[model samples]
Target: AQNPNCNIMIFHPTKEEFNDFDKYIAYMESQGAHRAGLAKIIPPKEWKARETYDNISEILIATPLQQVASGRAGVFTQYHKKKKAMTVGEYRHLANSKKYQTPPHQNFEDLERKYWKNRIYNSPIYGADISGSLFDENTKQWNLGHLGTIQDLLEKECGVVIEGVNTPYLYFGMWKTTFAWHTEDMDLYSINYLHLGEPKTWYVVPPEHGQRLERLARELFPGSSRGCGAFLRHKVALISPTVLKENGIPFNRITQEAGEFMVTFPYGYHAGFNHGFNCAEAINFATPRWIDYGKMASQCSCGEARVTFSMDAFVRILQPERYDLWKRGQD
Candidate 1:
């Protein structure tokens, strides 16, 4: 039986609507799209594609090759066993190489779980933060800063850059490369645009099921959870849809193609893997509605040492006169 509720919402916005990202988001939210936790937008054909940054080859970095075990709970036992340093060119070449792309073993066990034959390499070229780049200033309306609606909030209220949050970060993904389940910092909204390459497969749990997902994560990773409540933030855990459905949790799957945008809602848990080589950019943003979610998130998961900007400070800066009222309510 095909369930409509499990379907990932897709919005096909007009050119005029797509130009104002926040407005479109607001309209989508109004239509109850946030119930899906994550949604994809197909931009109009007339929209211009962004140029890939030129200095990628010069950036040498170490990428982790994750040793993933097979079986129902295989991902729970995975680890970043080793890392290899390579230029973007070398890594991309390896990513597209037949050896890495092809299965070395024909055996059933090897096919089910390529213990020694295939290793998943998740290369993160994140937090570039280059000055004078497309993400540098808030002036470029088309770039994430302005398009994310982050500029409208952080730029006008805080008047300070929050690097990865207000600004943007680039990601390079390849086949079998994955991002584990987690919400954005402070449970803020996040938008990701695929600049180029293959479609990325995404799985998301709506905010209503967020707690259920956390419970399952803790149950699955008792050892990790024993140390810190926010172990999910470590971004190492991947649970299959079968496991999710078995646990009575609802989710939607999304295939984000090139030149498209995906938006994640507040407190929504999401994870996915790339189909092949792809380049994407993402940034976190907050609208007025995010204040409550941010406040709750500020309580900090036990032993979770993640450092985020002070929400109190942000609210104070944004609305000095009403800050006192907000502070009392938050308390």
Candidate 2:
């Protein structure tokens, strides 16, 4: 069930407005839309990415449907550690198979849960890098790799190519394929473009409400949360909005379709499940302002997320003239 109060801010930008990612994002943030933690972008209808999938659709590993739906920590933890290997085609067949679809029940929750648990397939293929193939020759400025001026500082200045961080990664989703609650690595901003296919339902918690949600998650899974203050970083925990609302955590829900872009802010924790078969691409980028969040994330004792790249190195290259000032500001 959806939360009545969970309203996501959707942005409808014209070609000119959408062209300048930073200008529009800055405007949205200034308006306090960042409080939603997630925003939707509906580009002009003509904007589209063309790609052929069958070429690399042979082998991919996926998680079991039961485990994904379990929404428990241990099972999800295991799923990541040991996933069932299967071909992309096979998983797609099962994901959209009629056998997996259940008739509507008087109680939607019961039907949804049963359908997910009864499935014998695996979850969607996620975080697969295709930077070398897809979008390599594309001139689309909106591509994840080349979003805006300041947002590309990580790669443009540092010359570091971290797949899925600066480079784009493709995602394959089907009904009930879930991405558990978590923030982007280094708390960097992430933008996901649904290249083609069905809608993906997302839930996001505001930056201000992040800690509260963490506290509640810890309470729900005391053992794991105690094991790591940043337990959610593991991508092992899943909580429905119903539970969040019951616990007084603020969150907003949004559904993303093909040709739409979803921007997740720095330190913004988001999660969701796919409605059906779909293809999406996402990448993480750092803005000039992200330096503070990146530094703070590195210092986080709660969870030990490996630093993928050096922020110091990036800032130095990004603003050589102002490097000293940047250093002084940190102190």
Candidate 3:
């Protein structure tokens, strides 16, 4: 059931040019990147009423080891274990129960819709876990200048275009938290980079296959929320030497001090982790933009979903002006 999808391509940057933090930031800023928070699809009021299941894929990019360790350590650990090499079912169970011992602020939702499935497609050069929280009230925005420096260095030295920078709010987090595998309702495209540390563990699954997985988990786990169809029937794509070599992916044998690479998620199922052991750190950045593919086709349904469910909830947490900003697409 935990098999990786075979169709996707994986890329790793050369070692000599890894972790060029300085250049990455410049490119993002030059591209006019904004600090867009997580896509606000579920309006506050309908958060509870909105349909919890939809298929959406994510693109993740990681960077240098030093940068990985600078953020939240606890969250990093959670993400690492999930990516290191675990089953979707196993990850779901552990992440939901807090068996991995997450920080107090961390919340694990056992409900099937909240769990996230993941895949590991790249090797790390620095630390084990390189991903973290995207939106923390404390650190409103990720340090773009630092990332700009890295992006600038990478583009000047290497030839890669980090796209997530231009969006209103693109941020990076250590991939150490355990998010049960699930997709967004909206259609989105993104690219992720895996840099210095251990090779990150990743998996890609098809939505059609995810339904079965959900059924099995629900039957076995019991008391958990209903597992959505998109997550149940999906197939997984794991990125290890065995998987990558079979796929003809070029990778660095050395785990330490490698450069950057990217993963593009175009409405597919995917997830990742730091290489096993704490020796390596993984760093990455993402490019995200709001495109309304689903909105156009399902505007009426979306409107109903929003007014009946999201409006009250969104207005409650966000200030009137900020909420308006979201409506105006300024958010």
Candidate 4:
């Protein structure tokens, strides 16, 4: 139903691939992935896994490059902060507060109910916190906050969109944890860079394979033990480049420079996991709108147009009124 240009690139490091340290550095320099200011000390194999959440170790010496790598964490965190102290009751009250006018054609009550229902039943990990619209900013530009700013700078200075924005609607989770996955409403483009830990594992299959994936997920991990529901689905696609693998398994080298990949299919099925011990970080970006492919034949009447309009209209209508409030932290 939708058309998006797709491409893949991969980078791997080997003694043979890079004869000299200077040559390797030159390669990284070319790709704009090089960060010389942050000195990195590769930890021993055993120490890598243990350092997973140790922010100091992860941020400083271990894979500092991954941390400095441009992405949208700051935007997410900033948006996250806006909803910090508000409870479910407060959320409902604020949304219904007569100070704000509901759209003539939209039902504020229905929207509020749907929003809270999603927060309670759908999102078990991130919690309920509705911030101001992403489009309502002083700059009139989308900022994921700090991470988004960094990515913007990298794109401007380096000629590449370095961070992936996870749409607010999609759900992502750690592969083995039950608390990991849930669905949200957004479009996402993301990249997970494994620095110090194990190589994460992810499986990508066609939408038709969703049932099989769900069954596998259930069989692999079940019940409350399954953490979040194994079948948790998001409205966004997972994007990653195709890297050469040994016997279909991703390689285990820390120095490999896998390039970039993007996934845009609304119904494709993808699952990921961590494979190594080092500090691993990912960059994500997202938008809202689900393009229904089944309606492709009737191009003019397809759902994509409607979905796009709905999202645009929602943002456009809410943005102006919310701008000042957002600027004053009243949003």
Candidate 5:
């Protein structure tokens, strides 16, 4: 925070003053999830994973959304429209294995051991389809962040132009599962909410030093002989704080627990690991300030994300808010 090189910041506005999902839905409905503020949540003392699913099942079952069957590392396999679509019955089976013949108290401690052996992220990891298409057309409230300053204004035109690069993602993470180090496509911003689970530890570096990290990676990996810009233009899947410090590049860390939100700034490099079995939700979005970078991101690769983004339309669609946008190039 103090003029540091890798200073990716975190904002816990109320130190996590809220916890209930219903309260969260209410807050975002009124205030919108389109800002830089993030909040935290913690379930009741006797809460179980099953209970968490039970309560949220209503929202899931009602929506006929498609889910991808992802592997231990979150590399998802493609699912066609018919097979990919899910129902509530299948949801319970996957989340609650046969051994789970119980409730708040699970004999399944051994079952948990068995499940973790594979470390699979499993299928049905939800994304933009739900946030973009299915929602209250009149008011635009849909239990996820899809309105306020940043809404899915371009979900309507994909063929002629791309669409919805900033869709929300619902993730169920297993032990050691990871989302490697990278920036939001085109340097746009992103927000992640730890719905409920074991804490997730995040490692990050600010956008200001993005180029420096790229050069450092080139030095460490030398030429294409090794694997230097083998990924994104300048992306490193995993980098330890120790290694970064050794390279004179500072960084930041945080163990985000259930009921809290974490946001990353545009082009800021970030990566992290699952402490244990966990379920977190993420969404990529943009504000008026993101106009210029959105154009830049349109011309670049979106890391491993398997969705099409419409940057051309993104610029044209935000004209109504032109009053507040940072008119770049005038400088």
Candidate 6:
């Protein structure tokens, strides 16, 4: 009933939304790999010869933590290297800690180096917690990256400042580490770069068709319908490509490789699989165009999970002055 090529779109930045960042321009599909300027800045070395990374993931636990001001990745520095490796949940516990926050100290430089060395190679559920915000003169000078690019000029012009776009972490994985199908928290935009890896494959189900697939899923496999919570994800419900084609749902097959970026839209239903061991870094961001999506997400299954990011609160910042002229909204 449908053409298989009815996959997602894969285009590059042409207008201002891209800021002509020089880096991402050349690698624009039909005309990519133009290693001209800082093209290799983000990730230099090639696949086979590049250096290997270390991780303490063999023992990371999945415990919960209430408050962690500086975010989790930063506190990871406190982990002793010599100590026996940690599990997935254990690694998450350190990140989830609010009580033992990243010592609101000075210099981030020292913080980053140690951060990597002691990092538990757990990519299963790690987030890049870079401190793109203010630094307490108390914490050691943080390191490596910078934050909030002039690329966000559009959002700023529209009257909104979103945080947490920084602090990205390296997602390390080996054969078949799946991110499962899901959307960014509250329809936020996300970019996943296969920093270095054995090519990862992805599937994106347009949000419009997401519900249709869900209904079809339940009809086929009872109880997969209601309060199944977890956004009623189409999980192990493993609906195949042919099955999807029959339903007339749209999707794309993207074999993401190094030097390429996968830009996912808000509310897009996406899933991924690693061909082999790999490394990737993903970060979330918002645009003036994303306000409505953010608002909708603020009311999802995980909204109560975080404190900030409320459109109601955000509305206070936008209503009167910000919405003076250019204003029409919907999710």
lDDT of 3 by residue, 120-165 (tens): 2221222222233222234212222234332332344435444322
How many clashing residue pairs are found in candidate 5?
8
Question: Candidate 2's residue-wise lDDT over 176-259, tens digit each?
Answer: 667878888667888888876667778899876788888887888788876765667667677776678788888877778787
Residue runs of model 6 more than 4 Å from their true location after superposition? 1-7, 11-166, 217-224, 228-230, 233-238, 298-331
Distance from true position, residue 15, model 5, in Å? 12
| Full-model lDDT for every candidate | 0.65, 0.63, 0.28, 0.27, 0.45, 0.42
What residue runs in model 5 are displaced by over 4 Å at the alpha carbon? 1-52, 55-143, 149-166, 222-230, 233-236, 297-331
- Compose the digit string of candidate 5's lDDT tens values, residues 1-331: 2332333333333324333333444454244232222222333343332223434443343333233333332222233223354443454454455332122324334433333343343332222234422212342222244433243323332223434445555665434444556776546666676766565677666565666766665555454215323343333234455567778864666568776567665666776655444556676665544555555442222233333334334544543243123223111
Model 1 per-residue lDDT tens digits across residues 1-331: 2223645678888777766766777888877777778988887776654445565666554553644543344345444455666666776776678744534556433433442123333232221222222343533334674554543566555465533335566676666666778888668898888877776778899886788899998898888888766777666677877678788888887678888889999988998766666677787788867766765652333434334345555545445565565455455
Clashing pairs in 1: none
lDDT of 1: 0.65
What lDDT tens digits, residue by residue, belong to model 4 across residues 275-297? 11222334333222222222111
For candidate 4, report its TM-score. Answer: 0.28
Show model 3 residue runs off by greater than 4 Å.
Answer: 1-6, 11-179, 184-187, 226-264, 276-331
What local lDDT does model 5 show for residue 71? Answer: 33
Best by TM-score: 1
Indicate the worst ten consecutive residues by lDDT in candidate 6: 32-41
In candidate 2, position 115 carries an lDDT of 33
Error of 4 at 316 (Å): 12
Candidate 1: segments with Cα more than 4 A from true spot: 1-7, 51-78, 81-85, 102-142, 147-165, 298-331
Which structure is stronger by lDDT: 1 or 4? Answer: 1
